[PDB]
Amino acid sequence: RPIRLLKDLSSARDKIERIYGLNKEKLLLLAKVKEGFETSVFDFPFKNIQPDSPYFVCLDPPCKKESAYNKVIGDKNRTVYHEINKTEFENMIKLRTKRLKLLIGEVDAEVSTGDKIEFPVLANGKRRGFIYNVGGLVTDIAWLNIEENTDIGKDIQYLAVAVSQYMDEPLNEHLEMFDKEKHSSCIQIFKMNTSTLHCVKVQTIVHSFGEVWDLKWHEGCHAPHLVGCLSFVSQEGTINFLEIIDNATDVHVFKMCEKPSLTLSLADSLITTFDFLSPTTVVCGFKNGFVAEFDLTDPEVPSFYDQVHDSYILSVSTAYSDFEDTVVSTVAVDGYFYIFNPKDIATTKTTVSRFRGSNLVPVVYCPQIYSYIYSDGASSLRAVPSRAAFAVHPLVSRETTITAIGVSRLHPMVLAGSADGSLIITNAARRLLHGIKNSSATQKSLRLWKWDYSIKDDKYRIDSSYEVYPLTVNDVSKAKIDAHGINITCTKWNETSAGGKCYAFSNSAGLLTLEYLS
Template sequence: MEQVDNISKRRRGRPRKSSSQNKILAEQHSNYDDETFDVATSAVKALQAVERVTEDPDFMENMIENVGDNDDEEFQDNGIPSEDDDADTPLEEADDDETFEEEKPKRKVRKVKTETVTTLKKVTKTKTPINKNRIIRALKDLSAAKDKISRIYGTNETRLLELAKIKEGFEAYLFDFPEQHLQKPSEYYIPKITPSSQKNIYGQLHEKLVGNKWSLLSRQEADRKFKRRSEPLEVLIGDVQTTLDTSEKVEFPVFSNYERKGFVYNSGGMVTDIAWLSQDEVSDQYLAVAVSQYSDNPSNPELRSFNAVSHISSIQIFKMNSATFGFKKVQTILHNSGEIWNLKWHEGCKSDDSVGVLFFVSQDGCLKFIEASTNNSEEEEIILYDDIKTSISVPDNLITCFDFLSPSSVVCGFRDGNIGEFDILADSTVPSFFQKVHDTYVLNIVVAYSDYEKTSVASNSVDGTIFVFDPQDIKSTKTALDQRFRGSNTAPLVYNPQLYALVYSDGSNSVKAAIPRALFATHQLGATNATVTAISTSKCHPFDLCGGSDGSVYIENLIRRFLTGIKNISETHKNLRLWKWDYDQVNKNFRLNHHYETFKCTSAGSSKIAIDVHGINVTSIKWNENEKSGKFYAFSNSAGLLTIEKLDSVI
């Protein structure tokens, strides 16, 4: 048998090894020593071998040729011969005497990590710019307080500093505030000039007021024309029961847990509205109270509001000493204009010979204004107006509400949904503009004035709509505030100049607020357990009061809702119930509950409004907006019980 050389046949698919490669492998193999193996030394020798081989110009060419051969066969198993292999090639036979040495496995060469110098770049933090064009559809899109405040109030630095001052001075107080913060020496004092107080026009307006015809009456003559309640009222304040005759007051008793300063007064009829006189006097404060003689029957036809009605009604002027809580009736004004509401003092009519000028909307569909003269005598002065010539009216229509646009102009709402502006100094009653805004009876209209933006007007209607607009361009600026509510004849709407906020009710038990320049951001305030019937804000501080149909009175701090984020509102914002009137039908007495109770701010859910007894519902509530007496407030119910308190003991 022919002897075959002991040379293994190269399988197809394996790349040929060039001489250069063999040289590298040989040198690498010689570098390994099983007994003294040094990885670093071996790696250095291997790198030196690579450097020497790379000087060979044929090295890269051979590598490319070898790698490129038989690329399509690299997926075949190396142990199985291909079909193209020579079948005649004899297989190697192992001799019995031949011994094979088992090849030892080669150790892997670890690569030596070379240290590289890394240069650290200086990272500078850049503020992420606020996208002012970002679409904001609801208040929930502004979770951060900074984004929220800048979006709803703008970026005017003077305005933001003013808000920061108010926040610093009042945010820490939940339901009470220091009286010195309302006065000029305080760093938190921010004066607010109302539209009617920009100029004193008493001299011009007095010339028109002289034309009103009035006469003096005795008490017996006044009682024949205006029938007051003859029976006394049984009143239970805390645990102390007392009997209150008409025109009589009783101070709060000493309660078991704390002291409260104030009193309850029996006006003798249903109170339709009240108004504090804005003045700079320290001690004497004046309060005007509109009283109706039809208080026993709420469905009396004389109390209808959609048709013109004329009957005798009264306005009682009281002087109160803020130090001693003395309360004296100085004047009673009788008129034949029916019931009145929207009772307001003109803050731009100041005179030493007059208390002030009262504006009001009457049941006969007119806006009227009269003068309350100074009474230096100890006896009550009773005046009957036979004819009030200082009035504004429109033929075949009824004025339902008004507010001051300037010292000499007013804006009025009408029964058919129109809005009109009038000049109170002009001889003619032709409106400056008269435009349709709502579909029906306008309930309230307020002027939202600001030092940083144009004046806007807000109004709501029985049809359930609330609109905000620029009085100079109503058609193109009229914007709806909030969703249309179910419609009601009791939906108060007021303006808070401290926070430039509209505070309103949707005809149920919830109170909301919004900024005129950002009407999309409606803020849910504290809810009540009854229909909200009256709301009051002040130009001196950011606290609001609201009264309900169940006789409850609540207070809350608007700062803690507007100038904070929207997270954890139920924990940070609460309202406090100050009072609650109840009526015992068995014992026939009114009970004034003096216990405080707090409520969390929650979203409006299912209504729990119940039908309450006639006589306890709050008809009007007002803050005293004077600097020296800004902690006084008054509220009344339909039974004619007027309550006045100085906010001094609330924690």
């Protein structure tokens, strides 16, 4: 057959062998995922992500593959810090003074910096978890993971939030992505129990690296003195790795950083996004459209420095597999989405699409179904398998741009947040692993929450009401403008088995929110 457009893959078995190949050990995972999640339309049984489940499936990210601390850091490169008082902390990082009026169902509150609010009882069911107020622009969030075989309490878990001293203004001289900008910004590190949802701000780290994004914990940076190690790109144009050294106490501490354990930098170019290809090497993008793989052990010179885009590379993502090459995907302001193999870019570069030039394009990898998940830079969520770039399947349509996307290593549930304050959940596996014919009716999505705001009343008005949106396949792109603070800036599931039903999301005013899906 001349199999050259998605409509040629009419037979369900033909689709699966064309999109996923014939490696017997690879096909097992798809059968397990299908049976373990076909009935999981909007939620999944806790029993399916547990380490003993008959349907248990788990693919570790490449950074977890071997111990990295002695290679990436070690005693030769410990992070340099000093402790500080609350008076000087508040002198630089002017987090929001005036309280915000939240409404959550029937409850009002005026909520100050740090005011945890458990969900009040709501008419549509047993909501569990909390709203918060982090007090400035949440630019990124990152859940840590701990191996459940360790002596650490299986229900304790950690989360980090990167917070700007800048506020509800969306255009500022200080959030510029084009040029290098060092300024004071911070990381709030939270310890919480997945069992009782009780949470404490353990450490606050202050740094002059400017705003922080693409924030991720290195799951191989294990040492008895560390919580973990926290990795990010910063507005000073460098990649900074810093040690989250553990306290002898549950009491809060404020810290300032003089030198991070490992700084990746390059002459006359600013690094813009990054991802791990192994426990000790990272792919990264630059302002000038270049791509490079740095060695965390030998950070002086990159392994390669090749041009791949015409302008600012926005997001880079790794599609790891136990059966195929570690391909990398990239999108830029030039709108191209390219997939390539770092062994040789020039012989392997492939195009999935060209978008309208859009200044925030979330891209993530769903390792349970070997598919990239992306916003089209406008208002649709789409899936593309790494080995069949033409097989683009649209997942959901929204009236305003998709601004943040999250996915986990234990389940195929995708979370997407639009700049209208809507948060939606959908099962990507139901689209990828099944036939094309009845796609306009067999795949659906659910709104888990919606923020809203009043210009005159000045409230943030979180709506618990669930809404079902069916898949409009032939749909138009849309762009409804909405209140500056209500856009969703990040969204991520906890990926441990104990925490696997827990997720976190943030608006841009500061209203970080977590729920345990039970």
